[PDB]
């Protein structure tokens, strides 16, 4: 029992910034990577980026300029921030644990709707 | 990053049939490939990793194969519990892109 739970703002207006938090339980953020994945309505999974146990980050090259991933090891929280939202940013956003070439535990996701 | 293409995009099948789903990489991923099953309103669930290893609790009716840029997921005798969408994902280098998904629906 690894727990990952995402909480986000729900509905937000275009051009605003988005902040999502992934709160983890049962494991340490220093020993695993946390990935961010989103899923547009009726579409497939799209990888956003990841933060490694050591704090290094990797991002989807297509969205790199709009994304920032950070974490607080202390609070056991991982954050996703996206600048200047488009209606196309509408999706269910998930955090997933990475250990040895697999995402073994996933959060339930939080739906974000970009509407003005 | 590398991209993955899955085929078919959708497939209809009957309980008891055997199906194969494919995932093609735009470049060599050297076997770092995982498969996930996702049900409606649920988060994705890991089925197979490093091409052929089944995750804990996954029935043996599932098997993955491949190398280079061609990977496969085979399901023997589909059970009702097997319908839903399937995604492949690679772990080559510094990206973790996903294939577009394959939807499997009961005939």
JSON list of C-alpha atoms in Angstrom, two decimals:
[
{"chain": "A", "resi": 1, "resn": "UNK", "atom": "CA", "xyz": [0.00, 0.00, 0.00]},
{"chain": "A", "resi": 2, "resn": "UNK", "atom": "CA", "xyz": [1.57, 2.81, -1.81]},
{"chain": "A", "resi": 3, "resn": "UNK", "atom": "CA", "xyz": [-0.87, 5.60, -2.16]},
{"chain": "A", "resi": 4, "resn": "UNK", "atom": "CA", "xyz": [-0.77, 8.36, -4.78]},
{"chain": "A", "resi": 5, "resn": "UNK", "atom": "CA", "xyz": [-3.54, 10.97, -4.77]},
{"chain": "A", "resi": 6, "resn": "UNK", "atom": "CA", "xyz": [-3.81, 13.95, -7.04]},
{"chain": "A", "resi": 7, "resn": "UNK", "atom": "CA", "xyz": [-5.74, 17.14, -6.25]},
{"chain": "A", "resi": 8, "resn": "UNK", "atom": "CA", "xyz": [-6.16, 19.95, -8.83]},
{"chain": "A", "resi": 9, "resn": "UNK", "atom": "CA", "xyz": [-8.29, 23.07, -9.38]},
{"chain": "A", "resi": 10, "resn": "UNK", "atom": "CA", "xyz": [-11.11, 21.51, -11.46]},
{"chain": "A", "resi": 11, "resn": "UNK", "atom": "CA", "xyz": [-12.29, 24.20, -13.85]},
{"chain": "A", "resi": 12, "resn": "UNK", "atom": "CA", "xyz": [-9.83, 26.94, -14.77]},
{"chain": "A", "resi": 13, "resn": "UNK", "atom": "CA", "xyz": [-9.75, 29.68, -17.38]},
{"chain": "A", "resi": 14, "resn": "UNK", "atom": "CA", "xyz": [-7.43, 29.82, -20.44]},
{"chain": "A", "resi": 15, "resn": "UNK", "atom": "CA", "xyz": [-4.15, 31.69, -20.01]},
{"chain": "A", "resi": 16, "resn": "UNK", "atom": "CA", "xyz": [-4.17, 31.01, -16.25]},
{"chain": "A", "resi": 17, "resn": "UNK", "atom": "CA", "xyz": [-1.54, 28.74, -14.66]},
{"chain": "A", "resi": 18, "resn": "UNK", "atom": "CA", "xyz": [-2.37, 25.24, -13.41]},
{"chain": "A", "resi": 19, "resn": "UNK", "atom": "CA", "xyz": [-0.96, 23.70, -10.28]},
{"chain": "A", "resi": 20, "resn": "UNK", "atom": "CA", "xyz": [-1.50, 20.00, -9.50]},
{"chain": "A", "resi": 21, "resn": "UNK", "atom": "CA", "xyz": [-0.28, 18.16, -6.44]},
{"chain": "A", "resi": 22, "resn": "UNK", "atom": "CA", "xyz": [0.42, 14.48, -6.15]},
{"chain": "A", "resi": 23, "resn": "UNK", "atom": "CA", "xyz": [0.53, 13.43, -2.49]},
{"chain": "A", "resi": 24, "resn": "UNK", "atom": "CA", "xyz": [2.26, 10.16, -1.86]},
{"chain": "A", "resi": 25, "resn": "UNK", "atom": "CA", "xyz": [2.10, 7.67, 0.99]},
{"chain": "A", "resi": 26, "resn": "UNK", "atom": "CA", "xyz": [4.06, 4.57, 1.93]},
{"chain": "A", "resi": 27, "resn": "UNK", "atom": "CA", "xyz": [7.33, 5.15, 0.11]},
{"chain": "A", "resi": 28, "resn": "UNK", "atom": "CA", "xyz": [10.06, 7.72, 0.07]},
{"chain": "A", "resi": 29, "resn": "UNK", "atom": "CA", "xyz": [10.44, 10.32, -2.75]},
{"chain": "A", "resi": 30, "resn": "UNK", "atom": "CA", "xyz": [14.19, 9.91, -2.59]},
{"chain": "A", "resi": 31, "resn": "UNK", "atom": "CA", "xyz": [14.05, 6.33, -3.76]},
{"chain": "A", "resi": 32, "resn": "UNK", "atom": "CA", "xyz": [11.64, 6.44, -6.71]},
{"chain": "A", "resi": 33, "resn": "UNK", "atom": "CA", "xyz": [10.76, 8.67, -9.67]},
{"chain": "A", "resi": 34, "resn": "UNK", "atom": "CA", "xyz": [7.32, 10.18, -10.09]},
{"chain": "A", "resi": 35, "resn": "UNK", "atom": "CA", "xyz": [5.90, 10.54, -13.60]},
{"chain": "A", "resi": 36, "resn": "UNK", "atom": "CA", "xyz": [3.11, 12.94, -14.74]},
{"chain": "A", "resi": 37, "resn": "UNK", "atom": "CA", "xyz": [0.76, 11.63, -17.44]},
{"chain": "A", "resi": 38, "resn": "UNK", "atom": "CA", "xyz": [-2.38, 13.21, -18.88]},
{"chain": "A", "resi": 39, "resn": "UNK", "atom": "CA", "xyz": [-5.31, 11.83, -20.82]},
{"chain": "A", "resi": 40, "resn": "UNK", "atom": "CA", "xyz": [-7.58, 14.09, -22.94]},
{"chain": "A", "resi": 41, "resn": "UNK", "atom": "CA", "xyz": [-11.22, 13.02, -23.00]},
{"chain": "A", "resi": 42, "resn": "UNK", "atom": "CA", "xyz": [-11.65, 9.89, -25.10]},
{"chain": "A", "resi": 43, "resn": "UNK", "atom": "CA", "xyz": [-7.91, 10.03, -26.13]},
{"chain": "A", "resi": 44, "resn": "UNK", "atom": "CA", "xyz": [-4.71, 8.17, -25.10]},
{"chain": "A", "resi": 45, "resn": "UNK", "atom": "CA", "xyz": [-2.08, 8.73, -22.43]},
{"chain": "A", "resi": 46, "resn": "UNK", "atom": "CA", "xyz": [0.48, 11.41, -23.06]},
{"chain": "A", "resi": 47, "resn": "UNK", "atom": "CA", "xyz": [3.67, 11.58, -21.01]},
{"chain": "A", "resi": 48, "resn": "UNK", "atom": "CA", "xyz": [4.47, 14.99, -19.53]},
{"chain": "A", "resi": 49, "resn": "UNK", "atom": "CA", "xyz": [7.61, 14.44, -17.53]},
{"chain": "A", "resi": 50, "resn": "UNK", "atom": "CA", "xyz": [9.16, 12.90, -14.45]},
{"chain": "A", "resi": 51, "resn": "UNK", "atom": "CA", "xyz": [11.16, 13.91, -11.41]},
{"chain": "A", "resi": 52, "resn": "UNK", "atom": "CA", "xyz": [13.88, 11.39, -10.35]},
{"chain": "A", "resi": 53, "resn": "UNK", "atom": "CA", "xyz": [14.65, 10.34, -6.75]},
{"chain": "A", "resi": 54, "resn": "UNK", "atom": "CA", "xyz": [17.65, 12.73, -6.94]},
{"chain": "A", "resi": 55, "resn": "UNK", "atom": "CA", "xyz": [15.62, 15.76, -8.02]},
{"chain": "A", "resi": 56, "resn": "UNK", "atom": "CA", "xyz": [16.57, 15.65, -11.69]},
{"chain": "A", "resi": 57, "resn": "UNK", "atom": "CA", "xyz": [13.74, 16.21, -14.11]},
{"chain": "A", "resi": 58, "resn": "UNK", "atom": "CA", "xyz": [12.96, 15.12, -17.66]},
{"chain": "A", "resi": 59, "resn": "UNK", "atom": "CA", "xyz": [10.15, 16.47, -19.81]},
{"chain": "A", "resi": 60, "resn": "UNK", "atom": "CA", "xyz": [8.22, 15.80, -22.98]},
{"chain": "A", "resi": 61, "resn": "UNK", "atom": "CA", "xyz": [10.22, 17.90, -25.47]},
{"chain": "A", "resi": 62, "resn": "UNK", "atom": "CA", "xyz": [6.97, 19.12, -27.04]},
{"chain": "A", "resi": 63, "resn": "UNK", "atom": "CA", "xyz": [5.76, 20.69, -23.75]},
{"chain": "A", "resi": 64, "resn": "UNK", "atom": "CA", "xyz": [9.00, 21.54, -21.94]},
{"chain": "A", "resi": 65, "resn": "UNK", "atom": "CA", "xyz": [8.51, 25.33, -22.18]},
{"chain": "A", "resi": 66, "resn": "UNK", "atom": "CA", "xyz": [5.14, 25.21, -20.47]},
{"chain": "A", "resi": 67, "resn": "UNK", "atom": "CA", "xyz": [6.01, 22.74, -17.67]},
{"chain": "A", "resi": 68, "resn": "UNK", "atom": "CA", "xyz": [7.69, 22.70, -14.30]},
{"chain": "A", "resi": 69, "resn": "UNK", "atom": "CA", "xyz": [7.90, 19.65, -12.07]},
{"chain": "A", "resi": 70, "resn": "UNK", "atom": "CA", "xyz": [9.17, 19.92, -8.53]},
{"chain": "A", "resi": 71, "resn": "UNK", "atom": "CA", "xyz": [8.71, 18.03, -5.29]},
{"chain": "A", "resi": 72, "resn": "UNK", "atom": "CA", "xyz": [8.97, 18.54, -1.53]},
{"chain": "A", "resi": 73, "resn": "UNK", "atom": "CA", "xyz": [10.59, 15.39, -0.08]},
{"chain": "A", "resi": 74, "resn": "UNK", "atom": "CA", "xyz": [9.59, 16.61, 3.38]},
{"chain": "A", "resi": 75, "resn": "UNK", "atom": "CA", "xyz": [5.91, 16.90, 2.66]},
{"chain": "A", "resi": 76, "resn": "UNK", "atom": "CA", "xyz": [5.95, 13.86, 0.34]},
{"chain": "A", "resi": 77, "resn": "UNK", "atom": "CA", "xyz": [4.44, 15.92, -2.44]},
{"chain": "A", "resi": 78, "resn": "UNK", "atom": "CA", "xyz": [5.13, 16.17, -6.14]},
{"chain": "A", "resi": 79, "resn": "UNK", "atom": "CA", "xyz": [3.90, 19.21, -8.08]},
{"chain": "A", "resi": 80, "resn": "UNK", "atom": "CA", "xyz": [3.06, 19.83, -11.68]},
{"chain": "A", "resi": 81, "resn": "UNK", "atom": "CA", "xyz": [2.77, 23.43, -12.92]},
{"chain": "A", "resi": 82, "resn": "UNK", "atom": "CA", "xyz": [1.69, 24.41, -16.40]},
{"chain": "A", "resi": 83, "resn": "UNK", "atom": "CA", "xyz": [1.85, 27.96, -17.70]},
{"chain": "A", "resi": 84, "resn": "UNK", "atom": "CA", "xyz": [-0.61, 29.51, -20.12]},
{"chain": "A", "resi": 85, "resn": "UNK", "atom": "CA", "xyz": [-3.37, 27.03, -20.48]},
{"chain": "A", "resi": 86, "resn": "UNK", "atom": "CA", "xyz": [-5.13, 26.27, -23.74]},
{"chain": "A", "resi": 87, "resn": "UNK", "atom": "CA", "xyz": [-8.55, 24.61, -23.93]},
{"chain": "A", "resi": 88, "resn": "UNK", "atom": "CA", "xyz": [-6.59, 21.68, -25.21]},
{"chain": "A", "resi": 89, "resn": "UNK", "atom": "CA", "xyz": [-4.95, 21.22, -21.80]},
{"chain": "A", "resi": 90, "resn": "UNK", "atom": "CA", "xyz": [-8.31, 19.75, -20.75]},
{"chain": "A", "resi": 91, "resn": "UNK", "atom": "CA", "xyz": [-7.53, 16.22, -19.45]},
{"chain": "A", "resi": 92, "resn": "UNK", "atom": "CA", "xyz": [-7.35, 13.85, -16.50]},
{"chain": "A", "resi": 93, "resn": "UNK", "atom": "CA", "xyz": [-3.89, 14.30, -14.98]},
{"chain": "A", "resi": 94, "resn": "UNK", "atom": "CA", "xyz": [-2.16, 11.40, -13.16]},
{"chain": "A", "resi": 95, "resn": "UNK", "atom": "CA", "xyz": [0.96, 10.90, -11.10]},
{"chain": "A", "resi": 96, "resn": "UNK", "atom": "CA", "xyz": [2.58, 7.40, -11.26]},
{"chain": "A", "resi": 97, "resn": "UNK", "atom": "CA", "xyz": [5.42, 5.81, -9.39]},
{"chain": "A", "resi": 98, "resn": "UNK", "atom": "CA", "xyz": [8.40, 4.60, -11.42]},
{"chain": "A", "resi": 99, "resn": "UNK", "atom": "CA", "xyz": [10.64, 1.70, -10.23]},
{"chain": "A", "resi": 100, "resn": "UNK", "atom": "CA", "xyz": [12.86, -0.35, -12.55]},
{"chain": "A", "resi": 101, "resn": "UNK", "atom": "CA", "xyz": [11.29, 0.34, -15.92]},
{"chain": "A", "resi": 102, "resn": "UNK", "atom": "CA", "xyz": [7.63, 0.28, -15.00]},
{"chain": "A", "resi": 103, "resn": "UNK", "atom": "CA", "xyz": [4.98, 2.59, -13.52]},
{"chain": "A", "resi": 104, "resn": "UNK", "atom": "CA", "xyz": [3.68, 0.23, -10.86]},
{"chain": "A", "resi": 105, "resn": "UNK", "atom": "CA", "xyz": [1.40, 2.47, -8.87]},
{"chain": "A", "resi": 106, "resn": "UNK", "atom": "CA", "xyz": [-0.85, 5.13, -10.17]},
{"chain": "A", "resi": 107, "resn": "UNK", "atom": "CA", "xyz": [-3.04, 7.82, -8.62]},
{"chain": "A", "resi": 108, "resn": "UNK", "atom": "CA", "xyz": [-6.78, 7.99, -9.64]},
{"chain": "A", "resi": 109, "resn": "UNK", "atom": "CA", "xyz": [-6.17, 11.21, -11.54]},
{"chain": "A", "resi": 110, "resn": "UNK", "atom": "CA", "xyz": [-7.68, 14.65, -11.35]},
{"chain": "A", "resi": 111, "resn": "UNK", "atom": "CA", "xyz": [-9.70, 16.19, -14.17]},
{"chain": "A", "resi": 112, "resn": "UNK", "atom": "CA", "xyz": [-8.79, 19.61, -15.25]},
{"chain": "A", "resi": 113, "resn": "UNK", "atom": "CA", "xyz": [-11.23, 21.54, -17.55]},
{"chain": "A", "resi": 114, "resn": "UNK", "atom": "CA", "xyz": [-9.95, 24.69, -19.32]},
{"chain": "A", "resi": 115, "resn": "UNK", "atom": "CA", "xyz": [-13.10, 26.83, -19.77]},
{"chain": "A", "resi": 116, "resn": "UNK", "atom": "CA", "xyz": [-13.52, 30.66, -19.60]},
{"chain": "B", "resi": 1, "resn": "UNK", "atom": "CA", "xyz": [11.56, 11.55, -28.16]},
{"chain": "B", "resi": 2, "resn": "UNK", "atom": "CA", "xyz": [10.72, 8.17, -29.84]},
{"chain": "B", "resi": 3, "resn": "UNK", "atom": "CA", "xyz": [7.14, 7.48, -30.90]},
{"chain": "B", "resi": 4, "resn": "UNK", "atom": "CA", "xyz": [5.02, 4.38, -30.62]},
{"chain": "B", "resi": 5, "resn": "UNK", "atom": "CA", "xyz": [2.30, 3.28, -32.96]},
{"chain": "B", "resi": 6, "resn": "UNK", "atom": "CA", "xyz": [-0.21, 0.66, -31.97]},
{"chain": "B", "resi": 7, "resn": "UNK", "atom": "CA", "xyz": [-2.37, -1.50, -34.19]},
{"chain": "B", "resi": 8, "resn": "UNK", "atom": "CA", "xyz": [-5.20, -1.94, -34.55]},
{"chain": "B", "resi": 9, "resn": "UNK", "atom": "CA", "xyz": [-6.73, 1.20, -32.96]},
{"chain": "B", "resi": 10, "resn": "UNK", "atom": "CA", "xyz": [-9.79, -0.89, -32.09]},
{"chain": "B", "resi": 11, "resn": "UNK", "atom": "CA", "xyz": [-10.73, -4.55, -32.26]},
{"chain": "B", "resi": 12, "resn": "UNK", "atom": "CA", "xyz": [-13.99, -6.32, -31.51]},
{"chain": "B", "resi": 13, "resn": "UNK", "atom": "CA", "xyz": [-13.75, -9.87, -30.25]},
{"chain": "B", "resi": 14, "resn": "UNK", "atom": "CA", "xyz": [-15.55, -12.63, -28.53]},
{"chain": "B", "resi": 15, "resn": "UNK", "atom": "CA", "xyz": [-14.98, -14.20, -25.14]},
{"chain": "B", "resi": 16, "resn": "UNK", "atom": "CA", "xyz": [-12.70, -17.12, -25.79]},
{"chain": "B", "resi": 17, "resn": "UNK", "atom": "CA", "xyz": [-10.92, -15.66, -28.84]},
{"chain": "B", "resi": 18, "resn": "UNK", "atom": "CA", "xyz": [-7.17, -15.06, -28.98]},
{"chain": "B", "resi": 19, "resn": "UNK", "atom": "CA", "xyz": [-5.95, -11.62, -30.20]},
{"chain": "B", "resi": 20, "resn": "UNK", "atom": "CA", "xyz": [-2.60, -9.98, -30.78]},
{"chain": "B", "resi": 21, "resn": "UNK", "atom": "CA", "xyz": [-1.93, -6.27, -30.43]},
{"chain": "B", "resi": 22, "resn": "UNK", "atom": "CA", "xyz": [1.18, -4.59, -31.80]},
{"chain": "B", "resi": 23, "resn": "UNK", "atom": "CA", "xyz": [3.34, -1.67, -30.84]},
{"chain": "B", "resi": 24, "resn": "UNK", "atom": "CA", "xyz": [5.96, -0.32, -33.24]},
{"chain": "B", "resi": 25, "resn": "UNK", "atom": "CA", "xyz": [8.69, 2.08, -32.19]},
{"chain": "B", "resi": 26, "resn": "UNK", "atom": "CA", "xyz": [10.03, 4.78, -34.48]},
{"chain": "B", "resi": 27, "resn": "UNK", "atom": "CA", "xyz": [13.55, 3.87, -33.30]},
{"chain": "B", "resi": 28, "resn": "UNK", "atom": "CA", "xyz": [15.16, 0.96, -31.41]},
{"chain": "B", "resi": 29, "resn": "UNK", "atom": "CA", "xyz": [14.07, 0.79, -27.78]},
{"chain": "B", "resi": 30, "resn": "UNK", "atom": "CA", "xyz": [16.04, -2.28, -26.96]},
{"chain": "B", "resi": 31, "resn": "UNK", "atom": "CA", "xyz": [13.30, -4.19, -25.13]},
{"chain": "B", "resi": 32, "resn": "UNK", "atom": "CA", "xyz": [12.43, -1.43, -22.58]},
{"chain": "B", "resi": 33, "resn": "UNK", "atom": "CA", "xyz": [8.75, -1.77, -23.19]},
{"chain": "B", "resi": 34, "resn": "UNK", "atom": "CA", "xyz": [5.78, -2.08, -20.80]},
{"chain": "B", "resi": 35, "resn": "UNK", "atom": "CA", "xyz": [2.09, -2.75, -21.52]},
{"chain": "B", "resi": 36, "resn": "UNK", "atom": "CA", "xyz": [-0.85, -1.43, -19.51]},
{"chain": "B", "resi": 37, "resn": "UNK", "atom": "CA", "xyz": [-4.55, -2.18, -19.46]},
{"chain": "B", "resi": 38, "resn": "UNK", "atom": "CA", "xyz": [-6.98, 0.64, -18.58]},
{"chain": "B", "resi": 39, "resn": "UNK", "atom": "CA", "xyz": [-10.64, 0.26, -17.73]},
{"chain": "B", "resi": 40, "resn": "UNK", "atom": "CA", "xyz": [-13.33, 2.90, -17.96]},
{"chain": "B", "resi": 41, "resn": "UNK", "atom": "CA", "xyz": [-12.98, 5.40, -15.19]},
{"chain": "B", "resi": 42, "resn": "UNK", "atom": "CA", "xyz": [-9.86, 3.66, -13.82]},
{"chain": "B", "resi": 43, "resn": "UNK", "atom": "CA", "xyz": [-6.19, 4.44, -13.95]},
{"chain": "B", "resi": 44, "resn": "UNK", "atom": "CA", "xyz": [-3.92, 2.31, -16.09]},
{"chain": "B", "resi": 45, "resn": "UNK", "atom": "CA", "xyz": [-2.72, -1.03, -14.61]},
{"chain": "B", "resi": 46, "resn": "UNK", "atom": "CA", "xyz": [0.70, -2.53, -15.42]},
{"chain": "B", "resi": 47, "resn": "UNK", "atom": "CA", "xyz": [0.50, -5.90, -17.14]},
{"chain": "B", "resi": 48, "resn": "UNK", "atom": "CA", "xyz": [3.99, -6.60, -18.61]},
{"chain": "B", "resi": 49, "resn": "UNK", "atom": "CA", "xyz": [7.39, -4.99, -18.41]},
{"chain": "B", "resi": 50, "resn": "UNK", "atom": "CA", "xyz": [10.76, -5.39, -20.11]},
{"chain": "B", "resi": 51, "resn": "UNK", "atom": "CA", "xyz": [8.82, -6.93, -23.00]},
{"chain": "B", "resi": 52, "resn": "UNK", "atom": "CA", "xyz": [8.04, -10.34, -21.52]},
{"chain": "B", "resi": 53, "resn": "UNK", "atom": "CA", "xyz": [7.75, -10.18, -17.75]},
{"chain": "B", "resi": 54, "resn": "UNK", "atom": "CA", "xyz": [4.26, -10.34, -16.33]},
{"chain": "B", "resi": 55, "resn": "UNK", "atom": "CA", "xyz": [3.41, -8.16, -13.33]},
{"chain": "B", "resi": 56, "resn": "UNK", "atom": "CA", "xyz": [2.26, -9.86, -10.12]},
{"chain": "B", "resi": 57, "resn": "UNK", "atom": "CA", "xyz": [-1.31, -11.17, -10.35]},
{"chain": "B", "resi": 58, "resn": "UNK", "atom": "CA", "xyz": [-1.62, -10.87, -14.13]},
{"chain": "B", "resi": 59, "resn": "UNK", "atom": "CA", "xyz": [-3.08, -14.08, -15.56]},
{"chain": "B", "resi": 60, "resn": "UNK", "atom": "CA", "xyz": [-0.86, -16.19, -17.76]},
{"chain": "B", "resi": 61, "resn": "UNK", "atom": "CA", "xyz": [-3.24, -15.78, -20.68]},
{"chain": "B", "resi": 62, "resn": "UNK", "atom": "CA", "xyz": [-1.28, -12.57, -21.39]},
{"chain": "B", "resi": 63, "resn": "UNK", "atom": "CA", "xyz": [2.15, -12.73, -23.00]},
{"chain": "B", "resi": 64, "resn": "UNK", "atom": "CA", "xyz": [4.39, -10.15, -24.58]},
{"chain": "B", "resi": 65, "resn": "UNK", "atom": "CA", "xyz": [7.15, -10.54, -27.20]},
{"chain": "B", "resi": 66, "resn": "UNK", "atom": "CA", "xyz": [9.42, -8.42, -29.42]},
{"chain": "B", "resi": 67, "resn": "UNK", "atom": "CA", "xyz": [12.75, -6.78, -29.90]},
{"chain": "B", "resi": 68, "resn": "UNK", "atom": "CA", "xyz": [14.07, -3.79, -31.78]},
{"chain": "B", "resi": 69, "resn": "UNK", "atom": "CA", "xyz": [11.07, -1.75, -33.00]},
{"chain": "B", "resi": 70, "resn": "UNK", "atom": "CA", "xyz": [8.34, -4.43, -33.08]},
{"chain": "B", "resi": 71, "resn": "UNK", "atom": "CA", "xyz": [6.52, -5.62, -29.97]},
{"chain": "B", "resi": 72, "resn": "UNK", "atom": "CA", "xyz": [3.50, -7.72, -29.36]},
{"chain": "B", "resi": 73, "resn": "UNK", "atom": "CA", "xyz": [0.90, -8.44, -26.74]},
{"chain": "B", "resi": 74, "resn": "UNK", "atom": "CA", "xyz": [-1.06, -11.62, -27.06]},
{"chain": "B", "resi": 75, "resn": "UNK", "atom": "CA", "xyz": [-4.14, -12.59, -25.13]},
{"chain": "B", "resi": 76, "resn": "UNK", "atom": "CA", "xyz": [-5.34, -16.14, -25.10]},
{"chain": "B", "resi": 77, "resn": "UNK", "atom": "CA", "xyz": [-9.07, -16.78, -24.70]},
{"chain": "B", "resi": 78, "resn": "UNK", "atom": "CA", "xyz": [-10.30, -13.43, -23.76]},
{"chain": "B", "resi": 79, "resn": "UNK", "atom": "CA", "xyz": [-12.30, -13.28, -20.58]},
{"chain": "B", "resi": 80, "resn": "UNK", "atom": "CA", "xyz": [-14.97, -10.54, -20.09]},
{"chain": "B", "resi": 81, "resn": "UNK", "atom": "CA", "xyz": [-12.58, -8.87, -17.61]},
{"chain": "B", "resi": 82, "resn": "UNK", "atom": "CA", "xyz": [-10.03, -8.35, -20.43]},
{"chain": "B", "resi": 83, "resn": "UNK", "atom": "CA", "xyz": [-11.95, -5.71, -22.43]},
{"chain": "B", "resi": 84, "resn": "UNK", "atom": "CA", "xyz": [-10.77, -2.15, -22.20]},
{"chain": "B", "resi": 85, "resn": "UNK", "atom": "CA", "xyz": [-7.86, -0.20, -23.68]},
{"chain": "B", "resi": 86, "resn": "UNK", "atom": "CA", "xyz": [-4.19, -1.31, -23.92]},
{"chain": "B", "resi": 87, "resn": "UNK", "atom": "CA", "xyz": [-1.15, 0.94, -24.11]},
{"chain": "B", "resi": 88, "resn": "UNK", "atom": "CA", "xyz": [2.53, 0.26, -24.65]},
{"chain": "B", "resi": 89, "resn": "UNK", "atom": "CA", "xyz": [5.21, 2.56, -23.23]},
{"chain": "B", "resi": 90, "resn": "UNK", "atom": "CA", "xyz": [8.98, 2.58, -23.67]},
{"chain": "B", "resi": 91, "resn": "UNK", "atom": "CA", "xyz": [11.70, 3.44, -21.16]},
{"chain": "B", "resi": 92, "resn": "UNK", "atom": "CA", "xyz": [14.50, 4.06, -23.62]},
{"chain": "B", "resi": 93, "resn": "UNK", "atom": "CA", "xyz": [16.70, 6.99, -22.69]},
{"chain": "B", "resi": 94, "resn": "UNK", "atom": "CA", "xyz": [15.02, 10.11, -21.30]},
{"chain": "B", "resi": 95, "resn": "UNK", "atom": "CA", "xyz": [11.37, 9.85, -22.39]},
{"chain": "B", "resi": 96, "resn": "UNK", "atom": "CA", "xyz": [8.49, 7.56, -21.45]},
{"chain": "B", "resi": 97, "resn": "UNK", "atom": "CA", "xyz": [6.17, 8.00, -24.39]},
{"chain": "B", "resi": 98, "resn": "UNK", "atom": "CA", "xyz": [3.07, 5.89, -24.78]},
{"chain": "B", "resi": 99, "resn": "UNK", "atom": "CA", "xyz": [1.55, 4.33, -27.91]},
{"chain": "B", "resi": 100, "resn": "UNK", "atom": "CA", "xyz": [-1.88, 5.76, -28.98]},
{"chain": "B", "resi": 101, "resn": "UNK", "atom": "CA", "xyz": [-3.70, 2.79, -27.47]},
{"chain": "B", "resi": 102, "resn": "UNK", "atom": "CA", "xyz": [-5.74, -0.12, -28.66]},
{"chain": "B", "resi": 103, "resn": "UNK", "atom": "CA", "xyz": [-9.34, -0.47, -27.67]},
{"chain": "B", "resi": 104, "resn": "UNK", "atom": "CA", "xyz": [-10.65, -3.94, -27.17]},
{"chain": "B", "resi": 105, "resn": "UNK", "atom": "CA", "xyz": [-14.41, -4.40, -27.08]},
{"chain": "B", "resi": 106, "resn": "UNK", "atom": "CA", "xyz": [-16.66, -7.39, -26.70]},
{"chain": "B", "resi": 107, "resn": "UNK", "atom": "CA", "xyz": [-18.38, -8.54, -29.84]}
]
